[PDB]
């Protein structure tokens, strides 16, 4: 089975992604990985969060001469700020007397509302929030995106599938409810300050961000990931855990700051009558065709061949300076929460991470159905299935 | 690790639930299971879907004298309609000539929009939808509820945790946005025709159902499961898959007809400014207290001690008679989809299933943190943790 | 992924096996299951352990008209002795005053050396061994064999693979070290009182059993499972857990009373020089051929196309009357262990269980490589792989 | 759950180990890791396999100031020979014309008997053995040992458990069948050229190696890992996969070149009568005591408190120069296998790897029973269990 794991602290020496169970023969390079990582730098005000200097990407294992080997793929992402943190986040012991004179090593005892700090401190018995926030930080999503690049390459090469995203709403903007983009629209989306597909929505969202920035506040939003070209029959109806919507929901809701996930029209579908809620089927040249995609490409836990549409609701992830009451756990005193990040809105970049998690799940589901140990083998199995479906 | 699996076809001989990894010493009985199963009969018009005769519950393994043994727990739920289906759904071969004279055995070749039928037929290479719909059917949720009863008993006995649900909206009703219920409110909720906690919302929802029923249409809705009494620190921030919101989203989205999941204020949180989106913390007698629960009891992937609130969006699950165009896959001809169920709205009963899936995930997470092989052992570990938290 | 789980107590109402992840379209019937279950009745003196009355087999789910459906397959095996145990092993509470008058309900507080009793009592905090021995009992292997029948059917139909076993040694017999049997030899083996393939070894083993029976003692032995017809490349070298020898060792060592597992010549291979330890390769008509199979069909974690040979060492599983000192945990007093079973040797029947566990692992590994959701799909993928190998 | 994964090719840039699910608060350092890695350099003739220059160890994540953080722990092990391989094993594409002039890049088309080469080439559709041998190589066991160090630290700190190993036999030596060593014996064992605990066996084994070295041959052997101080009740009898012997067998048999695994007296137990096969129990001051440990510390799938003894049979792992016939898969011609390693015997070093795999499994099983997210929490749970057992 395709599996992925991330490791690293935000201010540690490096991040690591390991992907296990990918077939041999998939073409992917360090440049491909760096290109996807660069897409996390996108978005109005993103420079408040990310440093200009790009981190070094190193493929440590599992790829030779631009082709996967079949074994575990380990990718390392450096931390350009490591020299500042090499004592505070040293792996090995440091003289506590030396540490006592390092202002940067001071414990953090005032948990931020909305973050892992409080519950994590209690759970792990930490008197300092540092070990919690270092691992909880959305910097970890860089490692996800490295892993996701492998999944993306597989999906394109094996199935001709493309994954992209666009932003539906930020703050109080009027949601974009038109058709999703296609792959050819990605350049324009990624050139939008808010990674919008619609110009009216783009202007509205930019205005929301400007107003929040002026007020010293922060915003969340809704993003839609779109996967095009999928075959019918990934996922299964045979049990709850095998339903592709279950798997996608796990992967997307597990992203930092995500508080909701929908497939297609989601919560709006729940407000519709059955006569207008579903996608009717009609005869077409090369099989059954639909005129609507309210289902968002999944029915009964499986891909139906329509575009897959997965929406994620992101809470505002940056703590508002001076606004939020908390408690100093060291003393029990009232306190004010201090922020770790200063960006107003991370929704556009969060979209890129949603794409990644969707790609990983889709690649896993494809390998479950089509099997194979090399790309050519998987491709033969796919072709045979496609022929058997066509011959119906 | 706590694990659960369901088996059975809707019209097969019986359903089976197996729960593996529950500690010994949890008090649970066949009567407890039957009581939870009875809660699936709740809801206005539910008798259109469920037969009056109650199915037989049999505990086959893993419980002795009302106490779990520590091994796998297998629960069987009979099918009162089996005599009608004992040939059509016979496990063993039947003379195809005999089968040819059984009208009930006719293949189903007109997939219903919104259901597993089409994709499942293609995926598994079936020329008949029967094997797909028999396993995809929400009758399988009975087996889930049997398993969930074990989880519920554990949560109550080990942690003093209660799980309940109430309905937020059905069709175009105005959503109930007030506080959630407590455990003591469950009798009144379960006595409501729409399992509502609010009388205004109840009337509105009943009206929606009446109008849909008159129009020969069907409805979905939104339900909120609520878990009370949880300790701080179930789930973790250490990776996406360990976040309790990820796990809950998987379990809830994997329920038939669910198209969206939210934690707390979910999608509305994405429309709020950071200054009003989160739950501020204040000093209190026995620790930190909050005045709001916008987070729905989870922050950074972990329980924070507030009520857990998980909302599920359900599409309308019953196919509207004569409304939906489809294709006869045998001929390629246009067709009209024929319904398998006739109930207008299954939202209230679906709430009971959401409760079950939440309970299973919570029990698994509790056993992950607190360990133990017997209830008394787990309880000692819980008490020690609670003391260590209190002593802060 | 193919998964299997067993549930049941020895004296409970029934056993249940559930197999999840088997493809649709595999031909298997209740008669096939009963036939494999009957093979557990084989062996000299087996009637000391098994009652003459055959247990009822019922397929509850996942098979229709003799063909798998693709969903979970649940098989129930009745307990003919249930009426004797229906109070002592009742699932629901019984008046403790009534129980106090039932001699059969007396707690067991004298753990048997060599069994789960002592450690299980301590682990789970039981003051009675009953709940431990009821689940630990090798009666549970009946449920394994039911599950294994599904795996066997798949292996035969998809790959033309056969799994069998023969006994190498019992007690102090001289081990049979000749070639393994082929499928056509199974009738003769199953007709042997000790399921031997060699007549000299058969006589020696029968003599050992006769001597032990006269002395009131018990015996273990060594069995070899053999799987024929496997394709090259099941399992992988990419990590320890993916090595097929790792997976087979887990499955076989997890059988009750097994204390050792070898692949091919195992421990003897460790005593040989490299010049005589391995299987040299030579040109042949339809590919590479070997003249020896010291490796037992696995090299570097993968099938090499030779017969797979897996040997299991079984300790003597029946407690010797009056021989073994133990402690009464209720009092701390010295005691003598009392036996639960009276058979001298269960090695022949244990062989049948080893076959089953090998079949389950092989079926899982085949589905991992070849994928597919229906048998025809898996078969096409297999054929394509076989062609690609042949074309080398 | 505790999980471990390794990544890396033998001649790649680096190896990586990731351990997920270890509690926070375990004291472990890069020096501890390097010390365990150094123990792989032990053994007569080991310098034929390992280069004098020690590889760099870098802890990338999951440990701060010598204490685990609770998140994933990633450890990197450098490759001192990388400059020689940086083109041949480059991750990114290299001009095939440039590669054509690099003798080191020549494909390997003559699979070695006894290795992954042949089956791996066929499985993955490789025309070159290089990608197979690079990942299959026992160099990967360095990454295992890095991960195992974390497990070892946890076992010592949480449970007072020590894991060690000694060599039982090499080639045709007379096996050492005396008592196992204790922790205090490790210095002497690690100072033995063959890591023997017995002086007679040591001399015999050294003689075997000398004779094989003179004859240009290679040897395997048998090693015993010993774990001391374990609590009663790790593992379970509730299913085959939960039996600790199953889990240990998987972990040990998954080590390169291992062809057999035994618990305690293993295969010899299968040749004994029940009256002499098991460990009788007697009253003692602080509980039940045994006078023998034929069981090797496990009964019914669980630790019984005696020393755990796990034996592994290793085939000879280095290919004998000029001895083994194979086939050139490029041409179909007969060929002779060429060796990748030149050491006569790797049994002593293999023992260190067996220790590591045992430690990982034991740590996982301990965390399953005792739970906890920090060491102090786990320790409290352990103490409470120990008290509850003592109070019996
Ligand atoms: N990159 C980010 O800052 C981010 C924040 C939240 C979710 N995903 C990504
Ligand atoms: N019981 C039901 O009919 C049902 C339908 C959809 C989801 N959950 C339960
Ligand atoms: N059927 C049996 O009695 C048995 C005993 C031990 C192992 N496998 C089967
Ligand atoms: N280090 C080694 O060479 C080795 C070989 C085989 C098994 N384990 C380790
Ligand atoms: Cl912040
Ligand atoms: Cl319907
Ligand atoms: Cl016995
Ligand atoms: Cl070699
Ligand atoms: Na390929
Ligand atoms: Na669409
Ligand atoms: Na208890
Ligand atoms: Na609330
Ligand atoms: Na088929
Ligand atoms: Na053979
Ligand atoms: Na600690
Ligand atoms: Na010992």
Tab-separated table of N, CA and C in Angstrom, chain D residues 28-42 50 54-57 75 77 142 145-146 148-149 152 156 186 190 195 352 355-356:
chain	number	residue	atom	x	y	z
D	28	UNK	N	17.856	9.911	24.838
D	28	UNK	CA	18.667	9.278	23.831
D	28	UNK	C	19.393	10.342	23.007
D	29	UNK	N	20.625	10.024	22.614
D	29	UNK	CA	21.505	10.987	21.956
D	29	UNK	C	22.127	10.408	20.696
D	30	UNK	N	22.705	11.296	19.884
D	30	UNK	CA	23.402	10.866	18.680
D	30	UNK	C	24.574	9.944	19.033
D	31	UNK	N	25.216	10.186	20.179
D	31	UNK	CA	26.304	9.327	20.653
D	31	UNK	C	25.811	7.914	20.963
D	32	UNK	N	24.618	7.798	21.564
D	32	UNK	CA	24.013	6.474	21.781
D	32	UNK	C	23.804	5.732	20.470
D	33	UNK	N	23.296	6.439	19.462
D	33	UNK	CA	23.063	5.851	18.161
D	33	UNK	C	24.372	5.401	17.527
D	34	UNK	N	25.365	6.284	17.540
D	34	UNK	CA	26.677	5.944	16.977
D	34	UNK	C	27.317	4.739	17.678
D	35	UNK	N	27.159	4.662	18.991
D	35	UNK	CA	27.658	3.520	19.762
D	35	UNK	C	27.028	2.205	19.305
D	36	UNK	N	25.716	2.202	19.064
D	36	UNK	CA	25.086	0.978	18.577
D	36	UNK	C	25.484	0.655	17.153
D	37	UNK	N	25.620	1.686	16.328
D	37	UNK	CA	26.093	1.476	14.995
D	37	UNK	C	27.500	0.867	14.984
D	38	UNK	N	28.338	1.287	15.927
D	38	UNK	CA	29.698	0.758	16.029
D	38	UNK	C	29.689	-0.729	16.326
D	39	UNK	N	28.696	-1.194	17.084
D	39	UNK	CA	28.606	-2.631	17.356
D	39	UNK	C	28.408	-3.502	16.097
D	40	UNK	N	27.912	-2.928	14.995
D	40	UNK	CA	27.906	-3.625	13.677
D	40	UNK	C	29.278	-3.845	13.055
D	41	UNK	N	30.301	-3.191	13.574
D	41	UNK	CA	31.655	-3.392	13.081
D	41	UNK	C	32.317	-4.583	13.746
D	42	UNK	N	31.618	-5.220	14.684
D	42	UNK	CA	32.212	-6.313	15.439
D	42	UNK	C	32.228	-7.592	14.643
D	50	UNK	N	33.143	-3.723	6.012
D	50	UNK	CA	32.962	-2.329	6.407
D	50	UNK	C	34.252	-1.529	6.256
D	54	UNK	N	34.198	5.907	9.758
D	54	UNK	CA	32.879	5.822	10.356
D	54	UNK	C	31.948	6.823	9.713
D	55	UNK	N	30.695	6.413	9.543
D	55	UNK	CA	29.721	7.271	8.902
D	55	UNK	C	29.187	8.282	9.903
D	56	UNK	N	28.790	9.426	9.373
D	56	UNK	CA	28.256	10.497	10.167
D	56	UNK	C	26.790	10.176	10.533
D	57	UNK	N	26.471	10.339	11.805
D	57	UNK	CA	25.098	10.216	12.304
D	57	UNK	C	24.547	11.596	12.598
D	75	UNK	N	16.505	9.948	11.739
D	75	UNK	CA	17.953	9.821	11.917
D	75	UNK	C	18.572	9.560	10.567
D	77	UNK	N	22.085	8.644	8.320
D	77	UNK	CA	23.414	8.005	8.388
D	77	UNK	C	24.071	8.243	7.044
D	142	UNK	N	21.914	-0.951	9.040
D	142	UNK	CA	22.383	0.191	9.799
D	142	UNK	C	21.241	1.124	10.211
D	145	UNK	N	19.279	-0.432	13.016
D	145	UNK	CA	19.962	-0.265	14.300
D	145	UNK	C	19.810	1.152	14.857
D	146	UNK	N	19.790	2.178	13.994
D	146	UNK	CA	19.527	3.526	14.456
D	146	UNK	C	18.139	3.632	15.114
D	148	UNK	N	16.339	1.120	16.284
D	148	UNK	CA	16.350	0.244	17.455
D	148	UNK	C	16.940	0.865	18.702
D	149	UNK	N	17.857	1.818	18.521
D	149	UNK	CA	18.468	2.503	19.656
D	149	UNK	C	17.442	3.282	20.471
D	152	UNK	N	15.546	0.675	22.421
D	152	UNK	CA	16.387	0.237	23.540
D	152	UNK	C	16.391	1.183	24.717
D	156	UNK	N	14.939	0.328	28.495
D	156	UNK	CA	15.749	0.463	29.705
D	156	UNK	C	15.115	1.427	30.707
D	186	UNK	N	27.889	-8.660	28.551
D	186	UNK	CA	27.976	-8.129	27.189
D	186	UNK	C	29.387	-7.658	26.805
D	190	UNK	N	31.056	-8.945	23.376
D	190	UNK	CA	31.403	-8.029	22.304
D	190	UNK	C	32.911	-7.986	22.054
D	195	UNK	N	31.641	-13.128	19.024
D	195	UNK	CA	30.568	-12.716	19.934
D	195	UNK	C	29.934	-13.940	20.611
D	352	UNK	N	23.588	-8.334	16.321
D	352	UNK	CA	23.298	-6.993	16.748
D	352	UNK	C	21.988	-6.518	16.097
D	355	UNK	N	19.055	-8.172	17.813
D	355	UNK	CA	18.762	-7.441	19.038
D	355	UNK	C	17.850	-6.255	18.758
D	356	UNK	N	18.203	-5.509	17.709
D	356	UNK	CA	17.469	-4.315	17.347
D	356	UNK	C	16.000	-4.596	17.016
